[PDB]
Amino acid sequence: DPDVAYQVIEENSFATLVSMHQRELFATHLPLLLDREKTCLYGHFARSNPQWNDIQHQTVLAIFHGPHCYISPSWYETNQAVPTWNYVAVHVYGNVELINDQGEVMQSLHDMVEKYEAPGSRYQLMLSGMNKGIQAFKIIIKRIEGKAKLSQNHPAHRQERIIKQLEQMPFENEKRIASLMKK
């Protein structure tokens, strides 16, 4: 609904980027970062990945995946319940501009590196082969739609049962989904 969509984008930056390539749906998996002003998303394809060939001039879709997991009706007080899935997701629409300026490419590889290198990493900076090799781009953001199915449709007690059960399950999705519902 609101400003939580940005949070999901920044924490699940390995997006799926869907566009029409030659009149068929085409998707790439790849990190997409928000610029400081949060008005667009930067990424880069491999040049050998043909999706950029005709990615311009259309509203593409970037999907950011939050946590999900199965919710079992065996967790409620009753036989009378329907199974369901919990998840969180942010869909971003906008248009692409390919970026070839070599200063801009470098700036967006930098911001990316800072995002993913570990705090004590000494990594930072054949390399023009990393101009020949990649195709930076940006997605000027047009709209953002967020989904958060979190069983908030149910009474508070049934929700506590679901939490109690998920939080004691040794799986990432279950626990992450469990932190979400509480909030």
Next chain:
Amino acid sequence: NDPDVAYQVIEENSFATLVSMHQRELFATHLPLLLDREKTCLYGHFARSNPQWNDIQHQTVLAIFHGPHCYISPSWYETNQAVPTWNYVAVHVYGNVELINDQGEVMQSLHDMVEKYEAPGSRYQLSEVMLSGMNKGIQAFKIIIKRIEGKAKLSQNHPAHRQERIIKQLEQMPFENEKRIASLMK
């Protein structure tokens, strides 16, 4: 990847992203998609209030199943040996959609769904009337599979040790994705 490896990924990460063209815009729904025993088809269901099925029916849609994924750091090996990248596995399924409207087949797909996701313990059944109402609130469908593409980035273009040390680093990490990637690195 290789028919079998693909279905395994589809079977183990069934919570998919289903993308169609809707009123000239790209649309995605996140829902479980199960393979039938013959593995020619993917079954799913919508909320009815979801406009995606209104026109899903005469196009090649894309069902995306997500394997594990992680950052691979160029700090885990010597200068120049590599570039910053992610490792991951996905499978993409293309097909055309068919709306299932017989309650027998709908009920059937719903049973298979319970079977697959309930714990081996379980005692949970089709023990409600409530069932009718729930069913006028969903739209069942089937994807007739035309093609399957596997997608993998696992850094198999670095020699032994470079992959051998990437493995140890990954498995020392306290994260599901990295350990998942680490296994696949065989």
